[PDB]
Amino acid sequence: EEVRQFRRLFAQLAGDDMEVSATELMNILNKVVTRHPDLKTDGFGIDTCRSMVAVMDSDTTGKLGFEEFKYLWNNIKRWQAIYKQFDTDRSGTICSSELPGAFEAAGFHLNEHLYNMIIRRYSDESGNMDFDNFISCLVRLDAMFRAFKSLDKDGTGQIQVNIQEWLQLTMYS
Amino acid sequence: EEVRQFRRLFAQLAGDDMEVSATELMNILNKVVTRHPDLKTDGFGIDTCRSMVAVMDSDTTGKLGFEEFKYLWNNIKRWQAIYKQFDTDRSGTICSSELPGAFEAAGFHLNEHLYNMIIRRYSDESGNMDFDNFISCLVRLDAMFRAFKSLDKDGTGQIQVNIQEWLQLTMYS
Ligand SMILES: O=C(O)C(=S)Cc1c[nH]c2ccc(Br)cc12
Ligand SMILES: O=C(O)C(=S)Cc1c[nH]c2ccc(Br)cc12
Ligand SMILES: [Ca+2]
Ligand SMILES: [Ca+2]
Ligand SMILES: [Ca+2]
Ligand SMILES: [Ca+2]
Ligand SMILES: [Ca+2]
Ligand SMILES: [Ca+2]
Ligand SMILES: [Ca+2]
Ligand SMILES: [Ca+2]
């Protein structure tokens, strides 16, 4: 019902090795955005998709199995509706004054310093963020929240990170 | 003398805001790699160049000033010299067997598991890594080392961070 649609999409998408590569992901996402003329993008490029796959490849197989891919695709789905909803001037892009509302709608309450930092790294010189840049930021933000949580065993708001962990979390990303 | 010349390079490249943007960087890099046929590459792409700038933009102007650019540029020439040198089979790309030597000569000593991750994130399906991916890997690796060391002056092998700090460190990259 729910997951018969989805079980099929995953099987067709993952193909012969039954996992979703960076390329397979790239291609489906560009296919989907083709159908939404209200999402401005210059396309999901390969290195952005390798980075989304790495940050979601928890068992480190190199590729996304069914659960990893399901988690990603349902997020992307929720986040696309948010992008459209908070693009309140229909630029096809999310600008600096739209960005807070959008992020907090996805459950990320950042502060001004952090918002500005995000815009500096993900938005263009006018301070606009296109759809691929938006999704790829969110995937990462979501992963880095969840890696913090996983490390904050005692719920102190402070984590201790050893150099091995640091290098794995930042490089396989 | 080559300090005269390099200031001229910088000035011409940075133009009228006297800083190097990710676009300006992307262009000089692709321009420079065409002179070097032995460096195989599918191009430096805008996302990787935003990432490289962010990683290098210590003073957070969003762009690369003179010292920031020079630092990046000197690493890149050291590393391309290392790339050419460790490509023993002259393939114009760095394979899995050639890789440890090259990272060793850039002075990184990582365990097997970290190598495997890096190869899955940056190399192709035959374990082959091309020049833009190599350079992008090393810029990032170097910066993640320096960020960590900066916060672990005393060599405990651990840093302690809150969520704001963590997000600054892992997203402005
Ligand atoms: O816009 C809609 O009504 C839907 S059902 C979109 C949608 C549903 N699943 C999706 C996955 C990726 C992207 Br981009 C968009 C979608
Ligand atoms: O500039 C040169 O004549 C050489 S031999 C190397 C070099 C000097 N600066 C460089 C910057 C990027 C790359 Br790729 C190579 C170089
Ligand atoms: Ca596949
Ligand atoms: Ca996996
Ligand atoms: Ca807008
Ligand atoms: Ca984009
Ligand atoms: Ca400039
Ligand atoms: Ca700067
Ligand atoms: Ca080679
Ligand atoms: Ca490449």
Side-chain angles (χ1 to χ4, degrees):
Chain A
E1 239 313 316
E2 161 76 339
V3 75
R4 199 259 72 193
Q5 216 61 283
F6 185 74
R7 166 145 277 355
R8 171 174 293 251
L9 164 69
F10 172 82
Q12 307 194 158
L13 202 209
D16 281 8
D17 64 354
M18 307 183 297
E19 297 207 332
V20 175
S21 67
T23 313
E24 289 167 331
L25 175 69
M26 187 181 62
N27 291 337
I28 199 152
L29 259 14
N30 292 328
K31 213 164 277 112
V32 173
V33 306
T34 283
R35 291 173 253 194
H36 300 266
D38 44 345
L39 309 170
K40 197 184 179 57
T41 317
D42 62 351
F44 284 88
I46 190 60
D47 293 311
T48 303
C49 296
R50 289 183 82 164
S51 161
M52 286 191 267
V53 164
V55 101
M56 297 293 329
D57 178 28
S58 292
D59 60 5
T60 87
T61 57
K63 318 195 162 51
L64 306 183
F66 171 78
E67 292 295 339
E68 300 162 344
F69 177 72
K70 177 174 112 170
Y71 185 85
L72 173 60
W73 187 259
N74 291 330
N75 275 161
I76 291 179
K77 172 177 308 231
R78 282 159 16 76
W79 298 330
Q80 155 280 335
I82 288 166
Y83 182 109
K84 301 175 168 229
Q85 187 178 322
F86 280 82
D87 175 21
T88 48
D89 57 2
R90 299 287 183 278
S91 53
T93 59
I94 294 293
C95 65
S96 296
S97 52
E98 299 161 344
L99 173 88
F103 273 37
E104 68 190 46
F108 301 101
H109 307 266
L110 298 198
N111 58 192
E112 230 207 322
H113 186 265
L114 260 2
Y115 289 125
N116 286 355
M117 187 209 84
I118 282 160
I119 289 165
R120 229 190 293 117
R121 157 82 178 81
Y122 288 93
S123 294
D124 62 21
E125 161 75 311
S126 321
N128 277 295
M129 186 180 308
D130 76 347
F131 180 69
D132 60 292
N133 283 35
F134 185 99
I135 291 307
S136 86
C137 179
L138 283 176
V139 166
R140 194 175 178 79
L141 187 64
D142 181 68
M144 290 308 106
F145 268 91
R146 287 187 286 114
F148 189 98
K149 167 198 261 63
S150 169
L151 285 170
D152 189 11
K153 226 114 282 182
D154 300 330
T156 65
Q158 281 201 278
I159 75 173
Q160 266 220 51
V161 10
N162 104 292
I163 183 151
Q164 186 67 38
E165 288 158 330
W166 168 251
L167 290 177
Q168 289 171 179
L169 284 162
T170 53
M171 293 305 293
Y172 192 59
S173 223
Chain B
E1 214 327 288
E2 288 82 54
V3 58
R4 310 217 78 271
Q5 186 129 182
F6 183 73
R7 282 153 71 71
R8 204 176 60 72
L9 148 14
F10 183 72
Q12 188 215 275
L13 203 211
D16 291 280
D17 70 354
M18 304 187 332
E19 301 218 321
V20 178
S21 67
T23 303
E24 277 154 349
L25 176 61
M26 179 179 70
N27 295 351
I28 187 162
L29 261 15
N30 284 327
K31 176 195 277 284
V32 165
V33 304
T34 308
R35 294 149 206 171
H36 296 264
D38 58 329
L39 304 178
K40 213 154 57 67
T41 181
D42 62 334
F44 282 86
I46 180 71
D47 313 289
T48 289
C49 297
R50 278 194 272 264
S51 185
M52 281 190 289
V53 167
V55 146
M56 284 305 316
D57 173 38
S58 296
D59 70 1
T60 67
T61 58
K63 305 181 235 285
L64 295 189
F66 183 61
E67 290 313 328
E68 288 175 346
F69 179 73
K70 180 162 75 170
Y71 183 93
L72 167 62
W73 194 247
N74 295 342
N75 283 162
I76 287 175
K77 324 186 291 199
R78 283 190 318 97
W79 291 334
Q80 64 87 35
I82 280 158
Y83 189 97
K84 267 157 162 156
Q85 197 207 329
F86 282 82
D87 181 26
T88 49
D89 65 7
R90 298 281 149 271
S91 64
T93 54
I94 293 300
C95 79
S96 291
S97 65
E98 297 161 339
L99 179 54
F103 277 23
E104 211 208 296
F108 303 111
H109 288 272
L110 317 170
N111 75 172
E112 162 183 282
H113 189 245
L114 205 50
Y115 270 98
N116 290 345
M117 284 174 164
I118 284 173
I119 291 163
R120 283 173 159 93
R121 169 59 180 91
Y122 292 103
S123 299
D124 74 17
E125 225 65 27
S126 44
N128 275 335
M129 198 180 300
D130 79 350
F131 181 70
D132 64 287
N133 287 25
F134 177 90
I135 285 304
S136 150
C137 179
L138 285 169
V139 169
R140 178 175 194 85
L141 184 62
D142 176 83
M144 292 307 133
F145 271 98
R146 292 187 290 105
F148 191 107
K149 294 160 167 162
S150 177
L151 293 174
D152 180 39
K153 201 188 312 312
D154 49 317
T156 49
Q158 309 246 278
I159 69 190
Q160 162 157 104
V161 293
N162 69 23
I163 184 68
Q164 165 124 208
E165 284 164 338
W166 174 250
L167 288 181
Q168 291 167 155
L169 279 173
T170 60
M171 300 292 303
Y172 204 55
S173 82

